[PDB]
Amino acid sequence: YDDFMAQTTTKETLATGHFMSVINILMQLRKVCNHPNLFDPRPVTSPF
């Protein structure tokens, strides 16, 4: 969550003011606030 809010890319996408960008970023933040395994699930490891 910290790194997603930190990167200037998302900051500018928010400053844009467009409805989709703002609502999408808010949805992503809400999802990260929900046990982010949905936002970044733990991948199962297996030998190559």
């Binding site: 991948p43 199962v44 297996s46 030998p47 190559f48």
Partner: protein, 435 residues
């Protein structure tokens, strides 16, 4: 965590010049700005077989710079630390150990797609046919998204039988490797009994069959070992457990052949990328003349990575020869294929700052008077001893109840623990009493 927890980089400016005190290092400006050239050469991914020799007396920060090079390179490249004594293996050839170390010192990042079948199994019917062995197996995998009947192999059916699965439980299947795990019986059956010797796991979500991509990283030595001591499956190759089971004593015919061929095939098709790393060989002075001589071809090979040896001796007899001596305990044949880097001996001022950094890294609140007394302690003794004295002083301060280290604490610690030279003098005084 001590003895390497304070160094986290070379502390070089944007122009590659050594900064006075930064990144946990002080002094050694020449050595650090030179190792900057080495880290740049390693990050260039353009050369092969280059070798450096960090030469200096004990405790002059050669190993510190060796680890700072790795910290600067990051965790993306393989940094292989090795001691010269590791070549004396009892299962594989002495040169085999060194060549496999060189091979694992090279990296390879590869992006691979793999498929997976998962879902609450509804039924498992083995389709029989006369050969009179089982022909196929139809498994009905249910998921919260959908459901699919899939035909799998008799090997997968046998793996399920080993797992001791039953209809209605949850299993994780993979077609690339062929391994199948039993995640437990579906949560919907947990109400069947009051207690059972069964692990319960809810209905798997998503599609029954799903392909996912993973960007893994493995060294060339990993592929070498995977092809030399294969495990695979679908066979009874498990006899590996008793066939020979030493270190496989690899062979050049396949080390330089099939493996290089297949990895180049993977690279030139956009699937893999070569990631050359670093091979730091600390304590190179106890390597045999045979290892020193093989190092000639190792460094003159077009695939060897950047190597970094550490020299601590001035001039002694070479190991394995017993009659000849050379500088750094390395023969002039190999010493001509390296770029030597001095490690200056530290002065009182630099040693004081090093002690301060070590104390502030070990979570120690040492007073200025104690710090300055450690200056004299270090000018009379070794830097390593003066810095080792830190933690016992902190324990003694905690015992006495003071929140800081004073003169008396370090004095007590120094009086309790002697140094190398003091112990040598005591032994010389008690010569004919220590046996």
């Amino acid at each position: 965590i001590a003895s390497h927890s304070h160094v986290k980089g070379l502390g070089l400016d944007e122009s590659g010049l050594a900064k006075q005190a930064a990144s946990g290092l002080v002094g050694q400006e020449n050595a650090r700005e030179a190792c900057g050239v080495i880290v740049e050469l390693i990050k260039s991914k353009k050369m092969a077989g280059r070798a450096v020799l960090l030469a200096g007396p004990p405790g002059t920060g050669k190993t510190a710079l060796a680890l700072a090079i790795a910290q600067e390179l990051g965790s993306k490249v393989p940094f292989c630390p090795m001691v010269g004594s590791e070549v004396y293996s009892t299962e594989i050839k002495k040169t085999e150990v060194l060549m496999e170390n060189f091979r694992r010192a090279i990296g390879l990042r590869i992006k691979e797609t793999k498929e997976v079948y998962e879902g609450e199994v509804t039924e498992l019917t083995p389709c029989e046919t006369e050969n009179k062995t089982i022909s196929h197996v139809i498994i009905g995998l249910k998921t919260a998204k959908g459901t699919k009947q899939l035909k799998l192999d008799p090997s997968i059916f046998e793996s399920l039988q080993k797992e001791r699965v039953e209809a209605g439980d949850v299993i994780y299947i993979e077609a690339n490797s062929g391994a199948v795990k039993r995640q437990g019986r579906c949560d919907t059956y947990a109400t069947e009994f009051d207690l059972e010797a069964e692990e319960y796991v809810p209905l798997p979500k998503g599609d029954v069959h799903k392909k996912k991509e993973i960007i893994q990283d493995v060294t060339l030595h990993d592929l070498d070992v995977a092809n030399a001591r294969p495990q695979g499956g679908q066979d009874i190759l498990s006899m590996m457990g008793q066939l020979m089971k030493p270190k496989k004593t690899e062979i050049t015919d396949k080390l330089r052949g099939e493996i290089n061929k297949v990895v180049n095939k993977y690279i030139d098709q956009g699937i893999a990328e070569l990631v050359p790393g670093v091979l730091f060989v600390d304590e190179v002075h106890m390597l045999d003349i045979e290892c020193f001589t093989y190092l000639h071809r190792a460094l003159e090979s077009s695939i060897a990575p950047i190597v970094i040896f550490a020299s601590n001796r001035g001039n002694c007899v070479i190991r394995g020869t017993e009659d000849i001596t050379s500088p750094h305990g390395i023969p002039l044949d190999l010493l001509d294929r390296v770029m030597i880097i001095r490690t200056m001996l530290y002065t009182p001022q630099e040693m004081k700052q090093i002690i301060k950094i070590r104390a502030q890294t070990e979570g120690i609140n040492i007073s200025e008077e104690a710090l300055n007394h450690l200056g004299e302690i270090g000018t009379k003794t070794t830097l390593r001893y003066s810095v080792q004295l830190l933690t016992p002083a902190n324990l003694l301060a905690k015992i006495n109840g003071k929140d800081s280290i004073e003169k008396e604490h370090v004095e007590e610690i120094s009086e309790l623990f002697y140094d190398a030279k003091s112990s040598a003098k005591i032994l010389a005084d008690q010569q004919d009493k220590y046996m």
